[model samples]
Target: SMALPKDAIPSLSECQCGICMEILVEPVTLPCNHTLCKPCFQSTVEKASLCCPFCRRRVSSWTRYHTRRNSLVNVELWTIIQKHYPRECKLRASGYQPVRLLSK
Candidate 1:
């Protein structure tokens, strides 16, 4: 996976889950270095192992399970997301869909 620009500030759109097409609720990083929603990644791994939607990299089941148990959350990305979108944080706190805006 290609690295995001470290010095460049990413827009909220850049943090969306490719599978759900929604703002990432609980963001997780893949071994490929791609990030997606935790639930989306979990469901994908449950069905067919850990495969990155963007890069199509096949992650082994062993790594997937271990990653799930360990801290897989992308703290920096999640922090940036919550910082920019306080409304999402509120909605997510109440167990609601975190966003309404759709990215093109």
Candidate 2:
């Protein structure tokens, strides 16, 4: 168990999301020990997959009792995340499906 200054800048790898690979905002660290943006998991339901975005852990159901407690996230991820990844690309959620845009 290591400790550091409250204002210390942490490394960025843990700060990046596995799903989005972007920086985090109100980002998350799961009970299964994976990191993601808050919406990353919420988007699972949007995409009709309520499973854990990282390991398919069924985050929204099945183990709902587990999910209840497990669903919460670490604000720590937000702290580390805010520093390294800048707004490199302002990504737009196209909300596309079935292989996307028809015309070139």
Candidate 3:
């Protein structure tokens, strides 16, 4: 997994949204481990697609964009993802498909 910024401590700082913080209303963390205010994350989805922000795993579906051996990259799906990656099981869905074409 990629490392978080050295100083980028995960903080539920002061804010107005109750979902973000218990007192000041900070960003809320999702089951996927991604953190953001209720409004911010929701807005991200309303504007575009729905998926994990960190890994781009789609909440709607995991259908691989391409099929080759066992690699994949849903560019279309990832393009809009804007939060931390949810757990693998949470990612589980009926249409999950491997991109099947990985190149790193």
Candidate 4:
């Protein structure tokens, strides 16, 4: 429905999985042409079905691939989330920082 804060929203670049949530050591892509970390996609498949976790597209197969986690996260959206939920994190700045401070 709406976007979450930078710290709240999982970092994409840092995300090893193309799914963009947690750190991915081993990544995998579904037959639906979508990607995800091995454990994440596996758990997702177990909980739901062999479908594209993102678009809910059906998937019949998957391929394993090596993933390198990076910190190329979405800095802009993080700023927005910090601004909107300034009170939530209770930080002075309206963005993610090393520490949450009083909103300025």
Candidate 5:
């Protein structure tokens, strides 16, 4: 709901998947309270649903019934990422391009 800090530099490790070690993609979390990309389950869930690959903690999926997950992740990081790395990801708004008002 609030704008991001311009001077506060972002660290990649602040927000990144453990298994994929990639930035975010629609966030999702596990029982032990670790973050990962929402699409992570596509493969990991197939084999490692009972285990959190990030650590040895056994995780369980109590929610996420094709409708919504039990909890939601923050756009705080998302917004920060967008604000800091504009070229990488941009959320909320991107400015509208100027239109040619003069007729052809």
Candidate 6:
């Protein structure tokens, strides 16, 4: 895996959720091949069914409090955050931390 310096963090715009238009907090990927914040997804579900706001694709199971979702978290983005945003990653990892790998 490629590693980056903590100071080389990506800009907020690169990782901002399309729904809330904010820096992604607990990002989750939709089946439609897009990612949004978990809370944003829940709010979308509240307004409409669990559907992709951008693509209008429907999702069956979307739980709010549960750590895991029908869709998985964006691992690429998660890795980036874990590499650069240590504090945020620590806060977000209060429950189950996502899978990662280390090389020999």
> In lDDT terms, which candidate is top?
1
- Cα displacement (Å) at residue 9, model 2: 3.7
* Per-prediction TM-score to the true structure, in the order listed: 0.66, 0.52, 0.30, 0.38, 0.49, 0.56
lDDT of 1 by residue, 57-88 (tens): 77676455767788678788787777776676
Rank list by lDDT: 1, 6, 2, 5, 4, 3
Pairwise lDDT winner, candidates 2 and 5: 2
lDDT of 3 at 78: 29
What is the C-alpha lDDT profile of model 4 across 1-104, one tens digit per residue? 23334456443343335443444433454444455555565566534565666777765333222112432223444344344444543432232458542121
Clashes of each: 0, 0, 13, 7, 0, 0
- lDDT for 85 (candidate 2): 49
Better of 2 and 6 by lDDT: 6
TM-score of 5: 0.49
lDDT of 5 at 96: 50
Q: What is candidate 2's lDDT per residue for 28-99, written digit by digit as tens?
A: 555566656666756753245656555766555533553467635465655454454444213422223575
What is each predicted model's overall lDDT from 0 to 1? 0.68, 0.53, 0.34, 0.45, 0.51, 0.62
Q: Which residue runs does candidate 3 get wrong by more than 4 Å?
A: 1-28, 61-104
Error of 6 at 28 (Å): 0.7
Off by over 4 Å in 5: 1-7, 46-50, 56-58, 65-75, 90-104
Worst 10 residues of 4 by lDDT: 63-72
Tell me the lDDT of model 6 at 67.
Answer: 39
Arrange candidates by TM-score, highest first: which order?
1, 6, 2, 5, 4, 3
lDDT of 5 by residue, 33-94 (tens): 66566556445642445455556465543434432553444455556655555654433123
> Which lDDT tens digits does candidate 6 get at residues 1-104?
13444557686565667765655776877766777776776677534566676676776554353336433566776767556666655665563427332111
State in Å the error of residue 84, model 4.
Answer: 33
Q: Which stretches of candidate 1 lie over 4 Å from their true place?
A: 1-9, 61-69, 93-104
lDDT of 3 at 38: 39
